[PDB]
Amino acid sequence: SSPQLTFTHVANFMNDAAADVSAVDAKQLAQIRQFLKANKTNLIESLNTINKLRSTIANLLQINVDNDPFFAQSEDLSHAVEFFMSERSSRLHIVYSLLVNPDIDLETYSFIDNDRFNVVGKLISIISSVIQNYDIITASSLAHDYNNDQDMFTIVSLVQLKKFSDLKFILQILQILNLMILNTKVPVDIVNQWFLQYQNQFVEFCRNINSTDKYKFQNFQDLSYLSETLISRISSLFTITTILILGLNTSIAQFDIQSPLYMDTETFDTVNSALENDVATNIVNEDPIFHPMIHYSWSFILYYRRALQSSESFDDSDITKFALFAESHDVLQKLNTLSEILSFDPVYTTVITVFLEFSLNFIPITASTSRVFAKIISKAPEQFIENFLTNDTFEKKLSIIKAKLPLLNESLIPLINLALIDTEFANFELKDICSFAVTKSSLNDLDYDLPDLIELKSDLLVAPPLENENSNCLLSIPKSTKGKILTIKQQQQTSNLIIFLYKFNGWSLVGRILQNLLHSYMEKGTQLDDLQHELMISIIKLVTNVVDPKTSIEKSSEILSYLSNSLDTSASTINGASIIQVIFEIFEISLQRKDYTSIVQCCEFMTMLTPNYLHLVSSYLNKSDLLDKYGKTGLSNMILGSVELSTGDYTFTIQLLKLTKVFIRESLSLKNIHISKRSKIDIINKLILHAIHIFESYYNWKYNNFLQKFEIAFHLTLIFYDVLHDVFTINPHQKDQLIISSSANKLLQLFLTPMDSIDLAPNTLTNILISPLNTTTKILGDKILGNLYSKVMNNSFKLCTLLIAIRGSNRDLKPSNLEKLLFINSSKLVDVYTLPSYVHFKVQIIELLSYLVEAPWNDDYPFLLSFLGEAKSMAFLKEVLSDLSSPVQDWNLLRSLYIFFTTLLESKQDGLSILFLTGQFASNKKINDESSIDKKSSILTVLQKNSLLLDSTPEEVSCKLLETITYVLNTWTNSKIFIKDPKFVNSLLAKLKDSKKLFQKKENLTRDETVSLIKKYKLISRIVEIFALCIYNSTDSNSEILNFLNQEDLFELVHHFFQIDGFNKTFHDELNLKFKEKWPSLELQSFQKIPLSRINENENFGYDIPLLDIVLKADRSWNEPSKSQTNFKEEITDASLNLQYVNYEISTAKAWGALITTFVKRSTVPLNDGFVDLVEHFLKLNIDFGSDKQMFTQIYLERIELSFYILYSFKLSGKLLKEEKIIELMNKIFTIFKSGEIDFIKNIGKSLKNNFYRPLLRSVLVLLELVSSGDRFIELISDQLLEFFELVFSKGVYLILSEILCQINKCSTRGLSTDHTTQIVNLEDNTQDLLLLLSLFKKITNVNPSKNFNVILASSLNEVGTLKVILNLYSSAHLIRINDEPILGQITLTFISELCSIEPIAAKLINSGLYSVLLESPLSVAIQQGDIKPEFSPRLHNIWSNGLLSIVLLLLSQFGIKVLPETCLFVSYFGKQIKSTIYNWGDNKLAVSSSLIKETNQLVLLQKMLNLLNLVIGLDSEHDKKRLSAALSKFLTHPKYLNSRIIPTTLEEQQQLEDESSRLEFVKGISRDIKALQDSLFKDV
């Protein structure tokens, strides 16, 4: 059936597409909109709804069984409950997503806009219904007691989850309702319903749940503190909703009087009566029914409403009672607490800011009010802050403060508090103060002349604000200063003040006041007044805002200069006077006295001071005692152990972690070279030590605020990952250049530990990974409350993946304990994978599993199937199958699943792979047979289904699908279920044919064009690999691939895939050069990426852009290049794509070569002319020096091999081809073999790279086997053939034999190393000298050579020198023993016979006298000694005997009477062996074989031939022939005697005797040959 979409998946998709709607796939977007248009009423209306355990939980859910079929038949009831919660939350997620961004579906959005207030009323009714059944029925259901205890625990846990989910549901509905009713005119019906159900149901519920004074484990503060945390948010949101319904508007920053509430005279009465009833019955309960904000704002609403009308009647009877109530209930601190609780969303900050701006008119600005305003308003958006600061009422109230400014509590403290709103506003109000107000008890001390206009006739000394009494510092007012005297009460609804106009700076005054406060801080001690202490903290915070990096370094420096003008010069610890030193002294004193607020504020100051002033922070951290110094515990640990571990607040720890993050990032920069490396290294090491100390213990602390625990783990996992990533994934050829290398090494040592280790860092990481299975983590970590937990989790997943990758890249590192922990906790990750509420954690889990499986284990291998089990593995398979087959699917999830399948197929996890492929466990291996795959529960079915959607599927997903298919095909299975339906092969062929976008490839490609080319290459490589496998496994079943390969125009399509021309060496070399003059301290290769794994194959080429951004963040040339300057960012981005392009081009060339090779191997029919054209193309490509740049010289080798085998395949078939192409190929192969990248002449290549010229040698040998090419181009043919012949033969033979001389004696002063055993397998003489050279010699001699060719050959041989090296190698054979026998002489005779076969060479060599020279050798004398028999060395002895007889016979036959004396002396010297053989044959007891018959026939042929061409002992006299004939008559009559005398001494003789014996052939050959020769002799005589 159809899987059908669910609300959770649609909500996840809309969350993904909430940023950019156009960025998502258009078809998926259209299908999502089609789903939305069908479900328009089910979003909200379906929420409304007006065997004992299942009935109890069904009553708990307040929904019928048949209403939820998924809940009905779910085996695990917890899964059904989780699914129902997820669907209920996802409906409102969809509604909120539509409200926030209407562009997702404008048709469904309009369904809400036209029915806005009906939806609002429905939301209020739903909130009331949820509150009604929150505890009335759930508590009764929990109170039930049937039997068992595990069921009771499960029911209790489910009830607690349901209650917390109900609270989260209320929070969600409140968020949506506040979004809807904002800046809208609320009808009086909604107002009445809200003001009725708020008093009737909401406040009592909140108070009852807050105080529960009206199963033991997992019910402590881990549970009770949760409800108190949620109820506070719920009450704050009720307060905000009540404020919004009254008519607050953020567009005008004022209450909307024209709302229907105030135009109705009856609904106004109900609200007024409700507030009056709340006021009049307050004292019974100290907490009012309505928040003091509501009464406090109603006071102003009533005042404005009365002022709009004419009559007022009573004034204080009704207007002022609400104000008095609010003031007596401490409205300001309640407002501050309300602002603090609602900090998660920025809208409520705007609401409170506009409320404060509205209330400005009725509030005089004082110390407490200014403090509250600074605390609240400073977090508002910039536009609302500007609106508040530009208000006319605020300006008028600020002018009064600024009038009489230097009065401490009156004006100075409120102005300092107001300065904490905006930095530019503070600068404007503090830079140019132009008023000085002085109060004096006695007027005699002032010499002023005279109604308020006075003048000063002398200089005046006035003590500055908060000046020490003993200090001599005073402020001087010059004479002739106009003054104004004020002695009357302030005119708003004071002492004798005198105000002079005096232009002075306020920053200097504030700095002097701060120094004075420091002096009293270290004099009195810790008993400083709160007013002074808070003034000090406020001044420190103001300077912190001043020194913020958001300010320009110039103006920050100017302000800090202003702040230090009036400081005392008595201090001399550091030259000059600075406010930074004052704040540092305050920090040290506060650290000594354990003052939490002061240290927190100073740590914030020092955290924000780092980016622009690092030479001060580093110096302080060196001098201060906050960090450990040589075995001495620092002040930070003293505070953490005593103060923070008892109070439960860890603001200082989080501030320290933030400082660590900022310090590391600023130290990695390039503008901080003026700071020494050693200080930075020491400080970074100390900070990393502190961070590691914090990491191993924070998880067991007690937290008053739960979010703080998320704020710590977020900062810890963010520091480790950056340090490890910047070091272990960059700079392949170095390991310690970066300043953070030591910290990275120590972190790697701590995280990766051997098996026996028990270190707590891997345990903490693993505990973080499996957190979502906790109840408190499920509740607090939900996305409704916030997204900090999700960031924590993705950081942890990234860190764990990076650690596994780093370990896997080193063979020396043994398997770590973290991987064993992950293997043990592997069934706890499948649980997270299958959780309905966690669908944004699937890709990361799958990637982690793939990385874990890919890791190599040497000693012992852990099996995933053994850890998961039989039940947990099947659930994983079901979830994976459900994910694979969905109507709408995520591309990232599909890609990750394909990568996971590919990785699992390569690994040794055979059980899991078998389960995934076949759907059944590997334990039942007997089931494996034909049709033994469960089609319903196998990945193969889904692979087949998705393989046909190549056009719709994106190219990455399809290419990885093809990788998985190839891995399935090549090794795991032989039955090709894929090719049963030809649709797959047809789709592959269509993609290959229409993939012709590879035409231009050069015409100034853009970035997107290059990316598309890369993807196309990646797809085509996999396609041709699949085709190669399909054609190889089956010869003729895939007739369509054969037809595609047999087409006429294949060559034009495939010829460009074998050429690699997409690399720009000049571009890649000028970029590296130009990077070292702009920034000479850096080299571009330092930022090169390191490939750690194939799972991250896409991001493995080029340079790291984030690291370059970190290093060069402060450089203008990197960030804002000019028009006349190069753009290094874009060039580096381009250079990273070229490497990937070249890599995939080479891969595609390799795959195409493999496919063509495997096609040519099997084909038997004659090939087309397209392959001749392809061979010509390959040879020309090698002509143009395809390896001069050393561009992956295996392309050269594969081209050579392809050309050789295509040429060789023409021998098996006919292939009648013209001689012109033969000549072209022959000339091109000569030009390849001479000079160029090949190293045959230099003799260096032959010893090492013998594969670069041996295919060429066989190609030359077998290409000449075609029709003889010696007629048409006989001139060029002869010239090229002679050149190639001499160049190969003379040089190779001379060099090989010179090397042999080197191993036997001193050839070129290299040294003498004569020995029986040397080098390996005759170097190349075994193959390169006798397999090819003599064969090509014979081919030329069989090619009808001309006399002029022989003459030129002889001339070249004389120029080189011949047969001297032959005698030298014969002496080598004398001095070299192989298998305890001299075997190198078997080829000397062959070479001699080949040389002597032709007349000119033989005639030229005989003049040098080969006979005596070869006879003088000791082996020749040993052979001449006689008594040589085949019993000793049959094969070799017959070989040399036949060789010498053949050469003697041929020379005698060819040459005339000028050689007869030489032959006569040769046979006289060699006659002893012949006589011994004759005597042995006459005496019998000798093994005679076919070789002996051949030797006897050759001797007989030489005899009478040395006679008639006018000696031979044993054959000259006729008596010898008579005796031989008598012996012949004796033995020829007894074949059985000959068979008995025959002894098989040769393998061929043994084989012949085994098969029907050999006596018949032996006797027949002997009889025929001997009778013929005897008849010839008798006729001649």
Side-chain angles (χ1 to χ4, degrees), residues 755-816:
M755 291 315 291
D756 293 327
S757 296
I758 200 60
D759 291 11
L760 305 164
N763 287 271
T764 304
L765 191 41
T766 293
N767 280 349
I768 293 184
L769 280 188
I770 50 152
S771 65
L773 304 174
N774 289 327
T775 306
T776 181
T777 308
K778 267 166 170 148
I779 300 312
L780 294 174
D782 189 358
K783 182 62 65 68
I784 293 166
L785 285 87
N787 57 351
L788 196 57
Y789 176 62
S790 293
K791 293 153 72 213
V792 165
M793 286 290 272
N794 66 44
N795 285 0
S796 314
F797 268 117
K798 262 160 49 189
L799 181 83
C800 201
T801 296
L802 170 74
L803 284 167
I804 298 191
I806 290 162
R807 180 261 166 191
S809 288
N810 286 58
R811 182 72 269 172
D812 62 357
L813 294 170
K814 306 289 103 175
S816 62

Side-chain angles (χ1 to χ4, degrees), residues 477-715:
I477 297 89
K479 40 196 165 180
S480 88
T481 312
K482 156 78 177 63
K484 189 255 285 184
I485 294 185
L486 192 146
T487 50
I488 208 62
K489 260 71 63 178
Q490 51 208 35
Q491 322 292 322
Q492 285 101 42
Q493 294 302 114
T494 187
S495 299
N496 47 2
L497 274 295
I498 309 102
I499 295 92
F500 321 97
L501 72 164
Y502 195 31
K503 162 154 168 188
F504 74 103
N505 204 329
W507 292 109
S508 313
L509 189 68
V510 174
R512 178 75 215 199
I513 282 159
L514 186 63
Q515 191 185 10
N516 298 2
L517 286 186
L518 161 71
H519 286 323
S520 314
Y521 193 38
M522 80 190 156
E523 271 167 17
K524 303 164 40 179
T526 191
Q527 58 257 44
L528 205 61
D529 186 5
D530 295 344
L531 180 150
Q532 269 158 27
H533 193 240
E534 294 294 328
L535 181 60
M536 212 180 55
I537 292 194
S538 280
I539 295 178
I540 291 181
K541 181 178 250 292
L542 192 70
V543 186
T544 296
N545 286 344
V546 159
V547 74
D548 200 81
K550 280 159 40 187
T551 317
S552 313
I553 190 167
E554 297 88 20
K555 184 47 181 173
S556 281
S557 78
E558 207 183 36
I559 287 175
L560 293 178
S561 163
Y562 282 143
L563 276 156
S564 298
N565 274 24
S566 295
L567 294 195
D568 289 331
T569 59
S570 72
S572 304
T573 64
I574 311 179
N575 48 1
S578 184
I579 201 70
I580 316 291
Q581 312 174 26
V582 165
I583 301 154
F584 282 160
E585 297 187 53
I586 286 169
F587 195 21
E588 272 303 278
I589 292 159
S590 306
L591 288 165
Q592 289 160 16
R593 306 222 169 108
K594 308 159 209 301
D595 191 11
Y596 207 59
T597 60
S598 299
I599 66 168
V600 161
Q601 191 53 66
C602 292
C603 197
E604 295 194 356
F605 166 80
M606 182 179 72
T607 305
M608 288 271 144
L609 180 69
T610 304
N612 281 15
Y613 312 83
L614 192 50
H615 63 298
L616 307 169
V617 181
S618 74
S619 183
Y620 171 78
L621 279 178
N622 278 336
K623 291 169 193 162
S624 75
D625 308 330
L626 188 83
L627 299 176
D628 302 354
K629 307 153 62 181
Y630 289 93
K632 166 183 60 63
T633 303
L635 302 180
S636 43
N637 262 325
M638 179 261 287
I639 291 171
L640 165 69
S642 66
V643 191
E644 306 198 310
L645 282 194
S646 299
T647 58
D649 181 13
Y650 311 93
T651 316
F652 192 60
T653 287
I654 305 167
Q655 212 42 60
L656 271 169
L657 298 170
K658 294 183 182 110
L659 182 63
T660 307
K661 275 158 74 184
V662 180
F663 190 89
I664 282 157
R665 292 183 291 113
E666 298 316 305
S667 279
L668 281 184
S669 165
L670 191 77
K671 60 164 184 298
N672 303 311
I673 301 299
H674 61 85
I675 307 155
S676 54
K677 275 172 173 284
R678 277 81 50 204
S679 308
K680 290 188 270 200
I681 293 170
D682 298 8
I683 297 174
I684 287 160
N685 282 319
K686 278 187 289 202
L687 290 176
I688 294 277
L689 287 171
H690 198 33
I692 296 169
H693 174 239
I694 294 175
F695 180 82
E696 298 177 337
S697 43
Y698 72 93
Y699 182 76
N700 297 297
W701 290 342
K702 314 173 192 339
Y703 289 90
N704 288 341
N705 193 7
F706 73 97
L707 281 170
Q708 283 202 319
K709 191 172 158 178
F710 297 160
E711 217 167 356
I712 282 169
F714 174 76
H715 283 95

Side-chain angles (χ1 to χ4, degrees), residues 445 447 456-461 475-481:
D445 298 333
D447 207 11
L456 265 180
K457 64 173 168 297
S458 294
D459 310 335
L460 181 54
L461 287 161
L475 211 48
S476 171
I477 297 89
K479 40 196 165 180
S480 88
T481 312

Side-chain angles (χ1 to χ4, degrees), residues 1269-1534:
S1269 314
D1271 295 330
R1272 286 316 288 119
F1273 293 88
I1274 191 182
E1275 277 297 307
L1276 282 72
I1277 286 165
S1278 67
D1279 301 346
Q1280 267 67 77
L1281 193 45
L1282 272 163
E1283 268 273 357
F1284 161 76
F1285 176 99
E1286 67 95 21
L1287 190 137
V1288 60
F1289 285 130
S1290 303
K1291 278 191 191 53
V1293 163
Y1294 198 86
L1295 285 153
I1296 283 291
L1297 301 178
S1298 178
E1299 289 308 315
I1300 290 295
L1301 259 67
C1302 178
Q1303 290 93 22
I1304 67 168
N1305 73 280
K1306 311 275 291 188
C1307 180
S1308 54
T1309 73
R1310 180 87 153 193
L1312 59 90
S1313 302
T1314 179
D1315 205 39
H1316 283 150
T1317 295
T1318 176
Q1319 50 84 31
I1320 186 167
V1321 185
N1322 211 357
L1323 210 55
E1324 288 99 12
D1325 169 88
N1326 174 42
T1327 67
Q1328 289 315 103
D1329 278 337
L1330 63 89
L1331 271 298
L1332 272 300
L1333 309 179
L1334 57 87
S1335 282
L1336 188 153
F1337 282 140
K1338 297 156 172 186
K1339 282 324 208 180
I1340 295 171
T1341 57
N1342 202 35
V1343 175
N1344 199 5
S1346 185
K1347 299 288 96 176
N1348 205 341
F1349 180 86
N1350 312 138
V1351 167
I1352 301 296
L1353 192 154
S1355 72
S1356 195
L1357 286 198
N1358 291 135
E1359 288 182 70
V1360 171
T1362 55
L1363 280 73
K1364 52 174 70 175
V1365 289
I1366 285 167
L1367 270 297
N1368 282 348
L1369 67 88
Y1370 191 67
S1371 62
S1372 298
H1374 284 93
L1375 297 152
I1376 290 168
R1377 298 285 77 78
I1378 299 193
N1379 208 12
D1380 204 2
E1381 288 175 0
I1383 73 159
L1384 275 78
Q1386 295 154 121
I1387 62 175
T1388 71
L1389 60 95
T1390 69
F1391 276 110
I1392 279 167
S1393 60
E1394 280 306 303
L1395 290 174
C1396 295
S1397 179
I1398 206 160
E1399 169 182 8
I1401 303 176
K1404 185 177 288 293
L1405 66 92
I1406 284 175
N1407 306 326
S1408 73
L1410 269 295
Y1411 313 96
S1412 69
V1413 172
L1414 67 90
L1415 283 197
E1416 280 171 354
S1417 299
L1419 269 173
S1420 302
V1421 188
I1423 299 157
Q1424 285 170 210
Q1425 195 260 332
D1427 290 324
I1428 311 297
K1429 300 186 182 196
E1431 202 167 5
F1432 319 124
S1433 85
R1435 322 167 175 276
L1436 282 76
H1437 166 225
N1438 300 318
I1439 278 166
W1440 61 81
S1441 70
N1442 296 314
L1444 65 93
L1445 284 173
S1446 303
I1447 62 173
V1448 164
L1449 277 169
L1450 67 90
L1451 67 90
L1452 174 62
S1453 177
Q1454 204 279 321
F1455 295 88
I1457 50 174
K1458 65 186 181 69
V1459 71
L1460 271 295
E1462 292 161 346
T1463 315
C1464 286
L1465 64 93
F1466 190 87
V1467 301
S1468 80
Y1469 292 157
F1470 205 65
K1472 191 176 188 294
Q1473 156 71 24
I1474 315 168
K1475 281 294 287 183
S1476 72
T1477 316
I1478 288 184
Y1479 270 53
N1480 293 320
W1481 178 44
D1483 192 74
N1484 298 338
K1485 271 203 170 185
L1486 179 68
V1488 185
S1489 75
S1490 62
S1491 283
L1492 278 78
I1493 303 163
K1494 167 189 205 170
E1495 174 162 359
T1496 309
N1497 198 1
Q1498 284 164 323
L1499 285 165
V1500 168
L1501 198 69
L1502 177 70
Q1503 189 272 330
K1504 306 140 46 180
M1505 185 64 72
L1506 264 173
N1507 289 342
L1508 68 90
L1509 290 170
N1510 295 114
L1511 180 56
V1512 180
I1513 318 175
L1515 284 174
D1516 278 338
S1517 66
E1518 267 298 325
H1519 287 293
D1520 297 330
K1521 277 74 69 177
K1522 291 163 175 190
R1523 290 160 47 204
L1524 259 67
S1525 193
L1528 293 161
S1529 179
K1530 285 154 207 176
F1531 74 88
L1532 269 173
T1533 43
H1534 310 294

